[PDB]
């Protein structure tokens, strides 16, 4: 099991779930490089929704991908995954808000 290079800012999520998101996120950026952040965001939310036993309930999966963004969100307990991929240098925010 390999895991591509990444920087965690805040991970309030189980390790099993986080690892499974990063792998997809790396492959998904590698598919359409110099591609729009919403195109990568759309396909990433589809994956995490589509995969069974990934659902923690309450809100609905919603992913924000940027190079420069601050924020403040209300999310479900142990469901928020922030990370920044080192080769791409693009932060990825993924969570469920009730």
């Amino acid at each position: 099991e390999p895991l591509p290079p990444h920087i965690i800012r805040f991970n309030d999520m189980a390790q099993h779930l986080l690892k499974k998101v990063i792998r997809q996120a790396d492959v998904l950026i590698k598919e359409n490089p110099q591609g729009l952040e919403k195109d990568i965001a759309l396909n990433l939310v589809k994956f995490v929704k589509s995969q069974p036993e990934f659902k923690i309930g309450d809100g609905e999966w919603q992913c924000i991908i940027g190079k420069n963004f601050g924020c403040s969100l209300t999310f479900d307990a142990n469901v928020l995954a922030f990370f920044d991929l080192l080769p791409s240098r693009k932060s990825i925010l993924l969570f469920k808000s009730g």
């Binding site: 729009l36 952040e37 999966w61 940027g66 420069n68 601050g70 924020c71 969100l73």
Partner: protein, 87 residues
């Protein structure tokens, strides 16, 4: 000088959109930092439009987020882009 924002993508009531651009000019002058701006918007919008709410303040970003109907609004001030929604 800071001229009034311009709403790109929006689903708000004629009364509400005014209250959003209101809170937007107050927030931008009070706090310098990009996270501190967001943090004000939400907590003000937790008094007027019920517990659940979310706010982002990005110079360059992109997304798709699931929002309650009539409780979404995206306004771009001069060279800064603020996205807020509900649940």
């Amino acid at each position: 000088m800071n001229h009034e924002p311009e709403v790109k993508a929006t689903d708000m009531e004629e009364d509400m959109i005014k209250r959003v651009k209101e809170i937007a000019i107050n927030a931008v002058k009070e706090y310098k930092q990009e996270k501190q701006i967001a943090h004000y918007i939400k907590y003000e919008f937790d008094k007027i439009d019920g517990y659940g709410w979310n706010c982002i303040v990005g110079r360059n970003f992109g997304s798709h987020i699931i929002h309650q109907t009539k409780k979404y609004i995206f306004f771009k001030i001069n060279e800064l882009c603020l996205l807020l929604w509900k649940a």
